[PDB]
Design a protein around this motif. Structure first.
Motif, PDB file in Angstrom:
ATOM      1  N   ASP A 168      -8.036  19.420  26.844  1.00 34.17           N
ATOM      2  CA  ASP A 168      -9.064  20.461  26.741  1.00 34.17           C
ATOM      3  C   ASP A 168     -10.107  20.290  27.862  1.00 34.17           C
ATOM      4  O   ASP A 168     -10.656  21.273  28.342  1.00 34.17           O
ATOM      5  CB  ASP A 168      -9.758  20.487  25.354  1.00 34.17           C
ATOM      6  N   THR A 196      -6.921  23.573  18.896  1.00 32.03           N
ATOM      7  CA  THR A 196      -8.179  23.618  19.619  1.00 32.03           C
ATOM      8  C   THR A 196      -8.375  24.958  20.322  1.00 32.03           C
ATOM      9  O   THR A 196      -8.873  25.092  21.469  1.00 32.03           O
ATOM     10  CB  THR A 196      -8.328  22.382  20.594  1.00 32.03           C
ATOM     11  N   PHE A 199     -12.075  25.952  20.654  1.00 35.00           N
ATOM     12  CA  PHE A 199     -12.632  25.306  21.840  1.00 35.00           C
ATOM     13  C   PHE A 199     -12.284  26.056  23.098  1.00 35.00           C
ATOM     14  O   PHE A 199     -13.175  26.254  23.975  1.00 35.00           O
ATOM     15  CB  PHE A 199     -12.105  23.842  22.041  1.00 35.00           C
TER      16      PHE A 199
ATOM     17  N   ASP C 168      -9.331  15.632  22.924  1.00 31.07           N
ATOM     18  CA  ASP C 168     -10.162  16.344  21.947  1.00 31.07           C
ATOM     19  C   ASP C 168      -9.326  16.710  20.706  1.00 31.07           C
ATOM     20  O   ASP C 168      -9.854  16.741  19.601  1.00 31.07           O
ATOM     21  CB  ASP C 168     -10.838  17.607  22.539  1.00 31.07           C
ATOM     22  N   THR C 196     -17.108  17.758  27.004  1.00 32.40           N
ATOM     23  CA  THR C 196     -16.641  18.459  25.821  1.00 32.40           C
ATOM     24  C   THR C 196     -17.390  18.009  24.570  1.00 32.40           C
ATOM     25  O   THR C 196     -16.855  17.840  23.445  1.00 32.40           O
ATOM     26  CB  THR C 196     -15.071  18.355  25.672  1.00 32.40           C
ATOM     27  N   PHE C 199     -17.685  20.779  21.920  1.00 32.10           N
ATOM     28  CA  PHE C 199     -16.462  20.798  21.119  1.00 32.10           C
ATOM     29  C   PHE C 199     -16.476  19.734  20.055  1.00 32.10           C
ATOM     30  O   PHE C 199     -16.096  20.017  18.882  1.00 32.10           O
ATOM     31  CB  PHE C 199     -15.171  20.548  21.975  1.00 32.10           C
TER      32      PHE C 199
END
Lengths: 307, 306, 307, 306
Positions: A168, A196, A199, C168, C196, C199
C-alpha cells in the motif's frame, strides 16, 4: 474506461476440467447485477495460468457475449514473453475485448529495459485498446518500476496499472508521483487488494480488482460508493466486514495445498454455495477441499456476506 | 537412455525472429559431430519461453528429423501448469521425441503435493517416455524436493532430473540419497552447470546439460571422457579452460539488458562467429549486443575454444 | 503507557563518532515540544546497530534524564540473541527505562519456537516493564508470527508490537485478529510506517513510531489528532504533505551508499538545517551526503515542513 | 598463514549456559591432535552470536592459552557494524590472536561501498594481523562482491576469505579470478563447506573451515592430504563417508527448532558422546534435542566416524 470495481472473473469448471460456460454466464450476471463497473477476464483469479489458449478464448468470448455491452470487459494476455503475449492480443481482438492487461516477462530473467520494450510492443499490436500493466511480483518475480510506468503513461503506451504487490505504501507513492507529474487522467491506478480498498481510495486510487468481488460484488460496489462519498468511517467498517468474509481463503489446510487451492478454492466453494456456479471444481493440479473445509466456508459466507 | 553430455540446443533465428531451420540443422550437426550423447530440445537455452508453441514445434521437428536417430532427443514441455504442459507432451509425441523434460508449475503459487501431482499427470500422458524433472529455481521459483523426486523415481514416474539450481552440495546430497535408496539405475541425475561438471562427475552424476556445450561440444565430451577415465586433475584443467570460454556470457552490459540477453546472446554470437549459424539474433524482448561486445566475445572464443 | 506518536529518537554525533549529548538534549526538547506522546530510545533510527553498548547507555540516560518525566521513554534492547539482549535489559533498568523493545534473534537462523522462548526470557528479566516486539523483517530476516504475538499478549509476556514490515494489510489483519480475540487493551499495535499512518489509524492502530517524526514531530502529532477526531480527508491531506517531506530520504545517491546513509543522513541533514543538532555526522561506515545533496534536502524541508 | 584445515571451534557449555573451559581445552586438544592446521575461534559454529562479549573473551583466551603456539589461532570479530567490530578487534589483540575474521555489516542495510569501508577500518585497527572476510549470506544477508574482495587483497587490506555461501561455482570463479589477477599468494580462499571440500581443493582452494571438523578433525585432515597428494577418487570416497557422518545435523526435528539447534546440537551431542566435552548444552534460545534424537546421533557417529 477502466475505473471502479472491476473483478477478475473466475472460470467455473466441470469435473472433467472443461469450462462450465453456463455457470460462467450466471457468474457474469451475478457480478453485473451486483453493481460492478467492469470485468477483467483471464486474470489470475480466472485460472488463466491453468487454462489452455483455446479455453481462455472460450471463457473470454463467453464473458464478452454474455455481458452484452452492460459493462466494459478487459482481457488478460498473460504469457511468459512478448511473442506469446501478442498471440493472445490477437485472440482478444478477435473476441472483441475493450482493454488488455499484461505483466512483465516471466520464467525468463528480465530487466527494466526489456520490460519496457515488451509493453511497447504489446501496445503496438493493439494501439486502440487501453493497456494496463499488472504488477504481480508473487507470480512474475519482478516489480514494475514506477518511473518506467509513468514514462510509458506519458508516451501513451500504458493506460494504467492493476497493482497486486500488497504494498500500500508503494501504491500510494505511485499515485502521488503520477499526480505530481500531471498524469492523473492518463494513468489509472487500480489496487488488487481485497482488504485495503478503503486505503487505496483514501489515497486517490481509481478502483479495485478484487478476487473476492466474485463472491460479494455488491459489498465492493457499496464500499467504493461510501469512499467516493467521503464516508470514511463507514467505508472502514464495511471493509472490516469484507475482511471477515475473506477468511474463506484461510480455511483450506495449506500443509497439503497451495495458497491457490485454498484461496481460489474457497471463492469457488462460496460461489457454489450461493448457487451461482455448479461446482467448486478447480484445474489440475489444485487440491480439493474437504467436506469439513467446505462446511466451514459455507458458514463464513452465511455470516459475512453483504447482500 | 539420457546420460552423458546432452546440450540444451539453441534456437537460431533470422533477424525477423522466425526460426532459422537451416542454421538449426547445422547446429545439430555441430553438436553431434562434437561427440555429444544426446540433445535436449526446447530448454531454456533453446529460448523455449520466447518461442510460440508453433515455433517450438518447428524447432523440435527440425532437430529430430535432422538428427536422424544419431543420438536420442528429449523434448522440453515447459509451461505454467499441467493441462498446458500436456498439450506440449502431445506435440512431442507427434514429433517423435524420445524423452520429456518438465518443470514444477510456475506463475501460480504451488506446493510440493501439487508438484507431485503435476509430474504424475504428465507421466500419465506419455508413460513410455522417460520424464525428467528440471530443477530451475531461478525461473520457476520453487526448489524440487529431493524426497519427492526419489518417491516418484521409485514409482516409475520420473526417470531422472536435470538440476540447474547451481547448488553443487544439494546435487551431491541427492546423488548420495539416491544411491543409499538403491535407485541409482532408475533415476539419472544430470547437472545443468557449465562450470562444475567435473565436480558433478566426481560425485557420481550421470551427465550434464550445459548451454555452453552449444559453442564447444567437444570440450564437454572430452571432459566427460577424462572424468570417466578417472583423470581428475586433467578434467579440472579442462574445466578451467571451459570456464574461461564461459566469460562470453559476462561481456554484455547488464546495466541495460537481462542475463538472458548477455548469456544467450554471448553463445549465439560465438556460434555465428564460428560459422555454425547465420545470425546472433535473439527473440523479443532481448537486447542486442553491441559491435564492441561482439568483438570481445570473438576474442574470448578465439583464445579459449577447444 | 505506549500509545500515540512515539518517535524513534536519533543519535546526533560529532565528527569523531561520539554521541553529541548537547544536540541529543535539544532533539529531545524538539520532540516533546512538538507534541509527541512518548520516546523510543535506541531504535534503528537511533543508529543503535552502530553505537557501542557504552554509547547506547549514554544516549539512553541522556534521553531519560533530559525528558525529566514529561513523556514516557521506552528502550530498544536490540542484539542478536537472548543473553546479549538481557545484558541490555540490565542497562535499561539501570537507566530508568519505562518500556522495552526487542526483535527476534538475528544473525543466527531462528524458528518461531525459539522466538517465543526469546521473548519469554526477556520479559522474565524485567517483568514490570511493558515489552514490545519490533517486527522488522528487513533487518532481522524473520517475520513475527501474529498467532505467536497474540498468545504472548494473552500470557502477559508482550504489551504490544511496533510493526515496520511495510505491510499494511498484514498489520490490519493483526489488529482485526487482536480485536476478535478480545485483546484490544492488552496488546498495543503501533505502525512504523512514515507514509501510511492515516491508514493505520483508520484500521484502529494505537499509534506510530515514525523516524521522520524526528524532523517534523508536530506534523505527526497533528495527523494523529485529525485521525482521532475522525477527520479522515484532512488526515489524508496532511499525510500527503508529510509524504513529500519524506522525499528527503530519496535525495542521496544510492548508487554509492546504503538506504541507511541516504535516509538517516537525510533526517540528520534536515535536523542540522533546522538548528536542532550541530551536525549531520553519521556513524561509520555510513557515506557522507554531498553539498548538492544537502542543498536539495534543505529545500525540501523549507517547502514541506509543517511548523 | 591460515591455510589448510581450520575448524571453527565450538563453545562447550555447562547446563547453566556458562562457558565450560575444561571441555573447551579438551576440544582444542582433540582438534590439534586430529591434525588440524589452525583454529578459528568465535565463528558461527562457536555460538559467537549467542555468547556475550565477556563470554567470547573467555572462550578466546581459553583456546589461545591452551593451544600454546601449537597451531595459529584466528579470532572472529562478528558484530553488526564497524565501531562494534573494532571493540572486538581490541579484545582479540589483548588475547593474542594471530588473525581476524569479520563479516559485512548486518542488521543495518548496507552497500558494497560501505562494506569496503568497513573492512578498511577493521584492518586499520590491527594492520599486523591477517584479516579474512567471512562470506555468510544466510546470516548477514549480503553477498561479498568478489571484485571488491580482490581490490582489497591488492591493497593489502584482506589476507583471504572464508566462504560459506554454499555456492561452489561462485567460489571457483573467485579462485580463477584471483589467479588471473596474480593474487594467488596474497589472498587465501577457504571454503566453509562441510560436504564439498574435495571440490574446493580440486579447484585450488587453500583450505577449509568445517563445523563438522570439531567432531571428526582427522577425517578432514586425511581428506586434505588425499587432495594435496592428487588422490582425487580416494578423496571423493572419504568425502562421501564424511557426508554420512554429517547426517547428524539432520536428526533434530526442525518443525520445532531452528537449523542452529539441530546442526550445532548434533555436533555437540556427537562431541559429548565421544567424551570430548561434558554436555551437549546449547545457549538460549536453542531447543534441546530429545533422548531419541541423541540416540540416533550416537548411532550415526558410531557408524561413520573416521
Amino acid at each position: 474506461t477502466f475505473t471502479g470495481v472491476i473483478p477478475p472473473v473466475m472460470t467455473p469448471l466441470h469435473a472433467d476440467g472443461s469450462v462450465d460456460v453456463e455457470s460462467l454466464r450466471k457468474l457474469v450476471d451475478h457480478l453485473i447485477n451486483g453493481g460492478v463497473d467492469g470485468l477483467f477476464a483471464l486474470g489470475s483469479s480466472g485460472e488463466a495460468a491453468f487454462l489452455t489458449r483455446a479455453q481462455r478464448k472460450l471463457a473470454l468470448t463467453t464473458i464478452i457475449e454474455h455481458t452484452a455491452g452492460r459493462v466494459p470487459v478487459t482481457a488478460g494476455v498473460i504469457e511468459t514473453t512478448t511473442a506469446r503475449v501478442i498471440e493472445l492480443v490477437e485472440d482478444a481482438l478477435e473476441a472483441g475485448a475493450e482493454g488488455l492487461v499484461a505483466t512483465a516477462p516471466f520464467y525468463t530473467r528480465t530487466h527494466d529495459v526489456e520490460i519496457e520494450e515488451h509493453f511497447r510492443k504489446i501496445h503496438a499490436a493493439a494501439p486502440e485498446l487501453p493497456l494496463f500493466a499488472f504488477n504481480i511480483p508473487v507470480s512474475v518475480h519482478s516489480n514494475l518500476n514506477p518511473v518506467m510506468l509513468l514514462t510509458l503513461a506519458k508516451d501513451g503506451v500504458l493506460a494504467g496499472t492493476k497493482d497486486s504487490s500488497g504494498n500500500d505504501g508503494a501504491i500510494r507513492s505511485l499515485i502521488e508521483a503520477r499526480d505530481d507529474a500531471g498524469l492523473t487522467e492518463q494513468f489509472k491506478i487500480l489496487t488488487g487488494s481485497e482488504t485495503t480498498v478503503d486505503f487505496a481510495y483514501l489515497a486517490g486510487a481509481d478502483g479495485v480488482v478484487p478476487g473476492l468481488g466474485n463472491v460479494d460484488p455488491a459489498a465492493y460496489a457499496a464500499l467504493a460508493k461510501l469512499c467516493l462519498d467521503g464516508k470514511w468511517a463507514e467505508a472502514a467498517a464495511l471493509q472490516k466486514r469484507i475482511n471477515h468474509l475473506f477468511h474463506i481463503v484461510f480455511v483450506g489446510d495449506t500443509s497439503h495445498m497451495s495458497g491457490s487451492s485454498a484461496g481460489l478454492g474457497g471463492f469457488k466453494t462460496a460461489l457454489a454455495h450461493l448457487g451461482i456456479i455448479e461446482s467448486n471444481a478447480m484445474a489440475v493440479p489444485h487440491q480439493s477441499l474437504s467436506d469439513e473445509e467446505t462446511a466451514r466456508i459455507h458458514a463464513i459466507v452465511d455470516e459475512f456476506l453483504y447482500t
